[PDB]
Amino acid sequence: TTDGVYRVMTRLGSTQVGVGVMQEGVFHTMWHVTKGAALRSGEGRLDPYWGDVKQDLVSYCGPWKLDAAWDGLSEVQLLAVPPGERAKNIQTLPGIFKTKDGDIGAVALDYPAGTSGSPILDKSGRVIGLYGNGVVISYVSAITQGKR
């Protein structure tokens, strides 16, 4: 329940299927990581509360809380949590997904699939979106943010 970035694990043997963000008592990750499954946290259970396949997002225990957005000019940091590796910050200037519905920041960074759900941060340390839904041109991830 403590604020922070978390590995999402599954069990012959354990593997890391993704990453998520605890903030304000709500767990945020990408739909394709959990497919909405309930999550164990210690002796507790986290149940899904909101989700959307088109945004590829899911929240547990309450509504989506993350609302900061890329400012369109500044460098950002991916707080990548790869399987078997300590959480690490990768700084980058995002590119842009141009869509009919507006521009979305995108990061041209390619980490293992179990890194999906890792947060992208602005200079104030606020989560501007999650990593792991994108396109190949070399993989480029949207900076996927929900609505608060």
Partner: peptide, 23 residues
């Protein structure tokens, strides 16, 4: 069964590696 493990604080790091293009 799926479960979560804490891996860090959400914090900017001044000494971060810098890489990647901006397509």
């Amino acid at each position: 069964d799926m479960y979560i493990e804490r891996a860090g604080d959400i914090t900017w790091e001044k000494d971060a590696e810098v890489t990647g293009n901006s397509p």
